[PDB]
Design a protein around this ligand. Structure first.
Ligand SMILES: Nc1nc2c(ncn2[C@@H]2O[C@H](COP(=O)(O)OP(=O)(O)O)[C@@H](OP(=O)(O)OP(=O)(O)O)[C@H]2O)c(=O)[nH]1
Ligand SMILES: [Zn+2]
Ligand SMILES: [Zn+2]
Lengths: 57, 50, 90, 1160
């Protein structure tokens, strides 16, 4: 709901891939060196369908 | 509107939330949650506008 | 072909094959049986092959055929040894 | 009966998972100790990371201890220590392995975008797959009661479920749990049942995940790899030499981080092994397992999760993956500062004595030992190390016809590296021919070039027949000459014309060459008068040959003497009758098209020599009085400031809109700027008075500056306008324009204020330049990466279709014609003629035969031409369909390299592109190639029907248009925002405009047509080059758009699985082999799909080529999953492997090898 709707609606497509944005719109403990790669892998490359492979994962 | 989206309701929950935001790991206590916030904008050894 | 080398390509299309065959002939000259056809005049083997190609002699089919004759000369003329070896292991 | 078991030639490489036994096959021993080198003896330990028995010996042929020394025992191992004494390079190739106790998960197949171990098992990645192997939540491994097959349980749930049943559904936790999970999984039975279930009564509400997983599972099962190999139990070891610990200077060793990693994993693994023999507390052992997981994951690929530190350095440790995820130095090379060499030819360059001495070292050695002089090789070394005169003469022999290729730093296009014949020069700097000084885009500010020596025989011939400067007469981008004379020479030839009246003139006639005697002997001037002479012209027609034509024409002294330089052919005189400006290149071009190579080259050398010589004879300089200011300057400025003063006074008393008076006053100063500019030009242009016979006449100013401007030679109108006129509107950091332009000029004094204003323009100018210079190459990389795989092959196929070429006419409302876009183009088929016959079918439009397209009047302005866009070729490009545009005058040679040359030519003029309903500039080009949808995309009618409203805002909604006719309706979506263009009831055609705005290339290609969308792209990308004034052929754009439309989408039912979007390569080759194979009903119809450069380059057959540019960690992993193999026709992937390139001089090799790989 929250994460999915915010990520999809906002990122259309954030133009310059504004990373420093939705990373703060995420819960749990922040400042980790783990969740970083799970966002730079979805935004581009396999566009459109990748944004549907993100939520399911 | 800012208050409407604010989970915290008092001083303890606020300092604890801030402590969990700054140092995400160890369970926030009483001394740690307070001393950390004090050592951010209210201590010369940790903050100074010169 | 000191400066094109363009007059050689129309004799054998695609400059690449021109490079191949010319390098082939120049390879024959630099090491092994030399014997140029067009007078040297103090030119490297690089250009000598190009001169020959321009002259009209020494192409792809030419070198291949002469290689066939070369094989028929080395093999057929020296079979007395091979045949004698053929009876080695029955 | 082959079956050879040695290291011979390979045709392909295979990538796949590695079994534990597969790892054992590489094992030349087992690392068991964290020890590296001895603390005292500095000798490799027993079973450490640098063993001698396992890997390789330290010294070449002597063992560890010293029982055996020389080559006596090169095949026999040592008695005291099993050390195979062979080479020391053996230590560089030897593998080795570590066999862990408890299983360990591979970091790549675990967490790399899609959970490879998860998706194959259908299970959440960082959620479930983490908590069950980190020893936290136990998982099930198949149950026949109450519990499913892949659910997650807690310790409480575990014991409860164990108490209810137990001893019949046993399922562990951790690594080995996931191992049994993958192992128990049956890929076959699931591949069947999934196909059954995921096809029964389901619309587009499921098909996504269905087709996805089934294709993935089918790929994995057909790949051959067993899921057991997903998590490793045996971890291989990298060779010691690839991670050595070499002693630097005075102790202080230098080791790799991999040694730290392997040492850590060894330690943790050993403790884990020891704990599984002593007391075994669950918490301790499980923690050590997680720690072993940490060490292993850190060794394979750090990334990624906190990053293991240590090593004293606050920086992370370079893991294995970090060494293969992200400039080829070469011997026989050098570099130095360049310098002009006027006395040189066009196929020659100034190569320093000492420089050439060090370069051709091995050649000098061989030649010395060959002739005599030096008794041996070392004798030659000692002979050249002591430069003994005679050696130099030998050098003059080795560099005789041995070409050396030069190179500049910023290599934009093919002409970045050009070969020349070395000429010894007493100096330490490298001299270059001033003619080819433009191709390099090089100046003599202090720039330096590098030199390379073609060692291989065929390498020398490649440099002579391809990379030679004499072979690069024309530019690969545009057919126009590239070695065209520049500033100095053009000014010279411009001064060799310029008809001046009287002044030692008179019509004293002679005969060509004789006039030269007149010039040196003074008496007569040089720029008179005109004067008449006898010109012996030469022309040819029909049957070629040469036809004389002596006559008496009225030229000048300069034209007469300059006529001697002109070759045999050419129209003569009329090429000299003009001047020196732009026709200076035209003459060179025509000479090339009507004569050939050699005569065009010597003509260039002659015009260069003549240009420089007479330029020196002229003595054109630049004094302070050369830039004469207009007298009407102060007048015009006062008038402009008068108008603006009145406007300000009006603004004071309201009246005019003060909100935009800024714009109109800008028009005032802008107009005034044009007034001063026009005044200065009209003055500085004509002037003069002379005194012909009875005096009183006017020509054109001989004012040096004007002479430089009216003859190329770096001098434009704007610059001159700033020199004597005035610097107009100046930019402001806000982006706005100042309402007080620089009234003064460089000829005059400049106030501190306006200079402090101009500094902004200079700053932003240099800044923007620094940006677009790097941005140009940034685009070039993408262009090359997407296009560097297509090469002209299969000679010349059939087909006739092709874009109808027509002169780009903005003349609809602005008048601007360009009808040279058809030349060297292969005709589609007999494109008619106002009557009959004329044009043939496959006849390529000649340079003289394109001039024949003017004898058919202005009526014929449309010709169908075969292009690279079409062409029924397979994996290449038809020679005819392309063209001929090269440095060569003929058609492109079969097996060239269209892709790279195309990309280079496109991204070459990128340096001179100004970044910003008109974007314009480099960014506009990028958006066009990437095929991005506009910020306000228009809409088109998919099927021709009757326009009618579909429920006024009934959704949702937002307007709805429904063009329905013949059969079946359509419901488009109009979002209220933005108006319309077609009333209700009206009929539309197939692809009509119903938004009147920016068009989307996707809609055009999908609906309008491929010819239409390609025409759009080419005619829109050129429009941004028109403004910049950069000439570039349309062929190259068509080339990139060719593979820009590489893939498509099939929609029906065939051997291919419907939803899969595949390239028209396999599509066409399979549809051609199905209509006449079994049945045409076993195949579907495809549909072209527009995809950007990046999206297109992303997809490629070879996994190595992909591993080059895009993210290596992804491509390498996914290619590891499915047993893929490169085989092996790409350019890029065949470069890093270090073999012959499947193009150019190669191709034939690849073709032979390709046909060779048909036996099996
Ligand atoms: N086009 C052409 N020229 C050849 C050919 N063979 C020899 N030449 C010309 O020979 C001239 C100088 O060669 P040399 O080394 O001095 O004498 P060489 O012919 O015996 O080797 C050059 O003239 P140059 O090129 O006219 O000098 P320049 O025009 O570059 O100033 C060179 O181009 C050939 O096959 N084709
Ligand atoms: Zn030994
Ligand atoms: Zn074709």
């Amino acid at each position: 709901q929250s994460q999915l709707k915010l990520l999809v609606t906002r990122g259309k497509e954030q133009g310059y891939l504004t990373y420093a944005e939705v990373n703060d719109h995420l819960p749990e403990d922040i400042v980790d060196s783990d969740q970083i790669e799970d966002i730079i892998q979805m935004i581009n490359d396999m566009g459109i369908q990748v944004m549907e492979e993100a939520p399911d994962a | 509107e800012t208050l409407r989206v604010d989970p915290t309701n008092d001083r303890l929950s606020a300092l604890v939330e801030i402590y969990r935001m700054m140092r995400p790991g160890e369970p926030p206590t009483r001394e740690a949650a307070e001393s950390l916030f004090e050592n951010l904008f209210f201590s010369e050894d940790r903050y100074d506008l010169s | 072909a000191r400066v094109t080398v363009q007059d050689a390509v129309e004799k054998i299309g695609n400059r690449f094959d021109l490079v191949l065959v010319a390098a082939r002939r120049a390879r024959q000259m630099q090491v092994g049986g030399k014997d140029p056809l067009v007078p040297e005049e103090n030119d490297k083997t690089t250009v000598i092959a190009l001169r020959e190609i321009e002259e009209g002699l020494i192409n792809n089919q030419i070198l291949d055929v002469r290689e066939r004759q070369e094989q028929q000369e080395q093999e057929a003329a020296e079979l007395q040894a091979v045949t004698a070896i053929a009876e080695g292991r029955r | 009966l082959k079956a050879q078991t040695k290291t011979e030639e390979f045709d392909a490489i295979k990538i796949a998972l590695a079994s534990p036994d597969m790892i054992r096959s590489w094992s030349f021993g087992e690392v068991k100790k964290p020890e590296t080198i001895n603390y005292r003896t500095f000798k490799p330990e027993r079973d450490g990371l640098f063993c001698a028995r396992i890997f390789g010996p330290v010294k070449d042929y002597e063992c560890l201890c010293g029982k055996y020394k020389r080559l006596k025992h090169r095949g026999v191992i040592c008695e005291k220590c099993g050390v195979e004494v062979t080479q020391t390079k053996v230590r560089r190739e030897r593998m080795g392995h570590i066999e862990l106790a408890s299983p360990t998960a591979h970091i790549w197949f675990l967490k790399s975008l899609p959970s490879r171990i998860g998706l194959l098992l259908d299970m959440p990645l960082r959620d479930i797959e983490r908590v069950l192997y980190f020893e936290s939540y136990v998982v099930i491994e198949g149950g026949m009661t109450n519990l499913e097959r892949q659910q997650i349980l807690t310790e409480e749930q575990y014991l409860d479920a164990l108490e209810e049943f137990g001893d019949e559904f046993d399922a562990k936790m951790g690594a080995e749990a996931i191992q049994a999970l993958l192992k128990s999984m049956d890929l076959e039975q699931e591949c069947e049942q999934l196909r059954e279930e995921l096809n029964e009564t389901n619309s587009e509400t499921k098909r996504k995940k269905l087709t996805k997983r089934i294709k993935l599972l089918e790929a994995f099962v057909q790949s051959g790899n067993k899921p057991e190999w997903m998590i490793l139990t045996v971890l291989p070891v990298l060779p010691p030499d690839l991670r050595p610990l070499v002693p630097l200077d005075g102790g202080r060793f230098a080791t790799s981080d991999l040694n730290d990693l392997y040492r850590r994993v060894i330690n943790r693994n050993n403790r884990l092994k020891r704990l599984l023999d002593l007391a075994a507390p669950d918490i301790i052992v499980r923690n050590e397992k997680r720690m072993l997981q940490e060490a292993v994951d850190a060794l394979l690929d750090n990334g990624r999760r906190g990053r293991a530190i240590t090593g004293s350095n606050k920086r992370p440790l370079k893991s294995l993956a970090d060494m293969i995820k992200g400039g080829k130095r070469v011997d026989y090379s050098g570099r130095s500062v360049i310098t002009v060499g006027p006395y040189l030819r066009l196929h020659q360059c100034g190569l320093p004595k000492k420089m050439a001495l060090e370069l051709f070292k091995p050649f000098i050695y061989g030649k010395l030992e060959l002739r005599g002089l030096a008794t041996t090789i070392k004798a030659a070394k000692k002979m050249v190390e002591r430069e003994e005169a005679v050696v130099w003469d030998i050098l003059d022999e080795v560099i005789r016809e041995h070409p050396v290729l030069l190179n500049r730093a910023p290599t934009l296009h093919r002409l970045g590296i050009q070969a020349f014949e070395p000429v010894l020069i007493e100096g330490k700097a490298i001299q270059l021919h001033p003619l080819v000084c433009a191709a390099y885009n090089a100046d003599f500010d202090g720039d330096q070039m590098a030199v390379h020596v073609p060692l291989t025989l065929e390498a020398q011939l490649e440099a002579r027949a391809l990379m030679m400067s004499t072979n690069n007469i024309l530019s690969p981008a545009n057919g126009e000459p590239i070695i065209v004379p520049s500033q100095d020479v053009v000014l010279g030839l411009y001064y060799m014309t310029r008809d001046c009246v009287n002044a030692k003139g008179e019509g004293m006639v002679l005969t060509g060459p004789k006039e030269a005697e007149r010039l040196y002997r003074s008496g007569l001037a040089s720029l008179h008068a005109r004067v008449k002479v006898r010109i012996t012209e030469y022309e040819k027609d029909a049957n070629g040959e040469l036809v004389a034509k002596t006559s008496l024409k009225d030229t000048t002294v300069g034209r007469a003497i300059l006529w001697m330089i002109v070759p045999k052919g050419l129209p003569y005189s009329i090429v000299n009758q003009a001047l020196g400006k732009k026709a200076i290149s035209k003459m060179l071009n025509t000479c090339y098209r009507i004569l050939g190579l050699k005569p065009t080259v010597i003509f260039a050398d002659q015009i260069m020599y003549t240009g420089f010589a007479y330029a020196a004879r002229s003595g054109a300089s630049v004094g302070i009085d050369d830039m004469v200011i207009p007298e009407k300057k102060h007048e015009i400025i006062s008038e402009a400031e008068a108008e603006v003063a009145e406007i300000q006074e009006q603004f004071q008393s309201g009246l005019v809109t003060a909100g935009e008076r800024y714009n109109k006053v800008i028009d005032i100063w802008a107009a005034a700027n044009d007034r001063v500019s026009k005044a200065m030009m009209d003055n500085l242009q004509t002037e003069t008075v002379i005194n012909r016979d009875g005096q009183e006449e006017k020509q054109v100013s001989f004012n040096s500056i004007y002479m430089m401007a009216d003859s190329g030679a770096r001098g434009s109108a704007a610059q001159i306008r700033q020199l004597a006129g005035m610097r107009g509107l100046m930019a402001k950091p806000d982006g706005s324009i100042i309402e007080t332009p620089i009234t003064a000029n460089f000829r005059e004094g400049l106030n501190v204020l306006q200079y402090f204003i101009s500094t902004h323009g200079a700053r932003k100018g240099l800044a923007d330049t620094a940006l677009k210079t790097a941005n140009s190459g940034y685009l070039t990389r993408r262009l090359v990466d997407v296009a560097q795989d297509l090469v002209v092959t299969e000679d010349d196929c059939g087909t006739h279709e092709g874009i109808m070429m027509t002169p780009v006419i903005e003349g609809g409302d602005v008048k601007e014609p360009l009808r040279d876009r058809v030349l060297g183009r292969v005709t589609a088929e007999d494109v008619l003629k106002p009557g009959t016959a004329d044009i043939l079918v496959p006849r390529n439009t000649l340079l003289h035969e394109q001039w024949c397209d003017l004898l058919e009047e202005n009526s014929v302005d449309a010709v169908k031409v075969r292009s690279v866009v079409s062409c029924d070729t397979d994996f290449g490009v038809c020679a005819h369909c392309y063209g001929r545009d090269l440095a060569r005058g003929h058609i492109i040679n079969k097996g060239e390299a269209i892709g790279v040359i195309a990309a280079q030519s496109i991204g070459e003029p990128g340096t001179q592109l100004t970044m910003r309903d008109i974007t314009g500039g480099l960014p506009r080009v990028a958006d066009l190639f990437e095929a991005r949808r506009p910020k306000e995309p228009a809409i088109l009618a998919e099927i021709s029907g009757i326009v009618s409203f579909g429920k006024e805002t009934k959704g949702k909604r937002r307007l709805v248009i429904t063009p329905v006719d013949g059969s079946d309706p359509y419901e488009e979506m109009i979002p209220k925002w933005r108006q319309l263009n077609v009333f209700e009831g009206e009929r539309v055609e197939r692809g009509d405009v119903i938004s009147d705005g920016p068009e989307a290339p996707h809609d055009i290609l999908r609906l309008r047509g491929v010819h239409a969308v390609t025409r759009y792209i080419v005619n829109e990308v050129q429009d941004v080059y028109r403004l910049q004034g950069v000439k570039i052929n349309d062929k190259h754009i068509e080339v990139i758009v060719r593979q820009m439309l590489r893939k498509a989408t099939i929609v029906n039912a065939g051997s291919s699985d419907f939803l899969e979007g595949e390239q028209v390569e396999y599509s066409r080759v399979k549809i051609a082999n199905r209509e006449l194979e079994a049945n045409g009903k076993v195949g579907a119809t495809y549909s072209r799909d527009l995809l950007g450069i990046t999206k297109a380059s992303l997809a490629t057959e070879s996994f190595i080529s992909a591993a080059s540019f895009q993210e290596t960690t992804r491509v390498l992993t996914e290619a590891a999953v499915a047993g893929k193999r490169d085989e092996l026709r790409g350019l890029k992937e065949n470069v890093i492997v270090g073999r012959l390139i499947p193009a150019g001089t190669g191709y034939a090799y690849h073709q032979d090898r390709m046909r060779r790989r048909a036996a099996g």
